[PDB]
Amino acid sequence: QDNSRYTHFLTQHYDAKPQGRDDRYCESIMRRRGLTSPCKDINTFIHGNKRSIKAICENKNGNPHRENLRISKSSFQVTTCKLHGGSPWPPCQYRATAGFRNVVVACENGLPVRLDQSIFRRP
Ligand SMILES: O[B-](O)(O)O
């Protein structure tokens, strides 16, 4: 149930076990999560379990980062979906970059609520 900022973060940025990690996967998941109206230019999904992501908000799996962000201690499997072409309007074609990296989040009440998306602009 999507009734919190935490849960909405999961809807936007969490996919436990990605079926594949290619361009087709991106097109499909971006649509399924409601990020193709208008087409979001870049979005990153974090894989694996949820508790590893939550733990970024505490010393268990996070460190302070910049003014009030958190950076993970562990690395995460992630897939970044990059809008192909300029257009803000469907069909939204996407290119996937599968990666393994540290995640930065903004936390509220011990829960991640926002991803620093710009860190995934570069492969
Ligand atoms: O024990 B640590 O947080 O990996 O340094």
Author numbering: 1 to 123
Please quote the paper that reports this structure.
Angiogenin (ANG), a 14-kDa basic protein is an angiogenic ribonuclease and member of the bovine pancreatic ribonuclease (RNase A) family (also known as RNase 5). Like RNase A, ANG cleaves preferentially on the 3′ side of pyrimidines and follows a transphosphorylation/hydrolysis mechanism. In addition, the crystal structure of human ANG has revealed that it has an RNase A fold and the catalytic triad (residues H13, K40 and H114) is conserved. The enzymatic activity of ANG is several orders of magnitude lower than that of RNase A towards conventional RNase substrates, but essential for its angiogenic effect.
In the H114R ALS variant the protein retains only 2% of the enzymatic activity toward tRNA. H114 is part of the catalytic site (P1) in the native structure and makes direct interaction with D116. However, in the variant structure this interaction is lost and a new van der Waals interaction with L69 has been observed involving the flexible loop region H65-R70. The main chain of R114 also makes an interaction with Q12 (which is known to be part of the substrate-binding site in the native protein). The loss of interaction with D116 also results with movement of C-terminal residues beyond D116 thus causing destablization in the variant structure (where the Arg side chain is more solvent exposed compared with the His residue in the native structure) which will have major impact on the loss of catalytic activity as these residues are implicated in substrate recognition.
